[PDB]
Design a protein around this ligand. Sequence first.
Ligand SMILES: N[C@@H](Cc1c[nH]c[nH+]1)C(=O)O
Length: 246
Amino acid sequence: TSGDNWSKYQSNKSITIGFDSTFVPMGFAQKDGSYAGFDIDLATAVFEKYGITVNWQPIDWDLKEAELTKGTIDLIWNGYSATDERREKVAFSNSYMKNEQVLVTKKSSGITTAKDMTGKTLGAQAGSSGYADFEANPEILKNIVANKEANQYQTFNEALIDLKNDRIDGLLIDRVYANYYLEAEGVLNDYNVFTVGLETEAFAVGSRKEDTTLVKKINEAFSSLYKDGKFQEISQKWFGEDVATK
Ligand SMILES: N[C@@H](Cc1c[nH]c[nH+]1)C(=O)O
């Protein structure tokens, strides 16, 4: 099939992967500007099995579908939540990690439950699966937060600066990000982090629907990495635990 480009990636020994370069701990710009993270390590190890080098392309998370469809990237791999809505537009690998959407509030707010966001200001990442679930499940938060809206941000880092500065009262965000970020910045004990009854997510790798062979190759590589020690090594490095879905 024309859009099944595996043979091209294999012969060029290259594939382009798009990511939000602030999304810790999955794929992010480090203190020296180089990219690191769980997905950086995992994708590198996957494509190593085929002698393929990854070309990492930071993207605007708002534009990820457009960049994939237009061919400027070949995969979305960056804590990319595999949702039903997204399955209408892209194909997914098998999922490799669970995730949950949480609220983050300052401890000084005293807010540890969604109902105490009544009349309070919520923020979200504009292009996130979390924001999509905020709109799709309005009984959870949208109906009760100020203006029945979320302040929208391109990146969670900006949203978190706004939370720190009382510009928003709560932030809807991936738990993996919140846990890593707050620990890295030394401020775990300044914030509450809690689920609010959204259903769990899983992360997977997104491709163009027609790239069916590529998806199989990612899945086959996962099978090797689970038993060769590498998945566990990467998991321990970034999470201090085994996040394998088994
Ligand atoms: N998991 C969320 C948030 C995110 C991942 N990378 C950047 N933002 C999503 O898939 O939209």
